[PDB]
Assembly symmetry: C4
Homo-oligomer: 81 residues x 4
Amino acid sequence: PATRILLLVLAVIIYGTAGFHFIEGESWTVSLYWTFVTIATVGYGDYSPHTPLGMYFTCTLIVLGIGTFAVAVERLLEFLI
Amino acid sequence: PATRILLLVLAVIIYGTAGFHFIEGESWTVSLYWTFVTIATVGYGDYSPHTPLGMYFTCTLIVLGIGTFAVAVERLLEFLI
Amino acid sequence: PATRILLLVLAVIIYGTAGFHFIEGESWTVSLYWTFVTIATVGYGDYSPHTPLGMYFTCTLIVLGIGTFAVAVERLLEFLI
Amino acid sequence: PATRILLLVLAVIIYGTAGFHFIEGESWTVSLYWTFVTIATVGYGDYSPHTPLGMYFTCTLIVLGIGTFAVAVERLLEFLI
Ligand SMILES: [Ba+2]
Ligand SMILES: [Ba+2]
Ligand SMILES: [Ba+2]
């Protein structure tokens, strides 16, 4: 069900944002922006992890986030069109 | 229908381009180039939002753009091959 | 047929590489590397178009390249596994 | 079978990491981080190949990695949801 996928993406977003903020020390706004940019796999590289923990964290975010986000946008696609 | 998807991508492009131009202050050419680069999820990071509004705007563009663009290229694929 | 898709990707690669070389003035090696990095939508941003023509060219490359490349890797996936 | 795909992604990861380390001279941590960031097609451009060999290597990594990684995350998606 699409709504459940949405909930998974929301959980991923919180995880991404909190982690970047507390591991890398960026603001909450930058961290959320980075989370979206990373999980949509856009990844501008204006922000990126600079510590070894941040890098490991980024890899797990990638593993949890990218699949979940892809299915969310295409389920949203189906629903609105 | 493929043509309707195309229209959605065109609307997304206009939205992306106008927004980056007026929120971030880049030229129209740069803004359109950034829109394509962002919604195809290529995202070089030569251009990126630098304000909190631009960042929020970028996230919504990502949500509206990436799904629409993916389906457009693959429907175009089917049509030409 | 997978082989025909491969031929399309090869044509896209030549187009991408020649264009970046002659429009942006990078070496042939850099241009090919940029073409792959762009059409796989990896896009590091170590190389990017700096002229208005290069930017327009990049958008058309994106439109022609990304769909073709995606289907090529997944058809290659099927064939080898 | 999903587990076999996982094994392919693990092999790709080792290949990516060892190659970047020995070709480009980055640490093992940076090389692994770059491998994930590249094969998920996130590609921040904080790290990128700077030699002609590294660039050729990156293209082959892209060809081997991106398809394998995409199918792995979506098979993982199915398994956990
Ligand atoms: Ba990217
Ligand atoms: Ba991408
Ligand atoms: Ba990128």
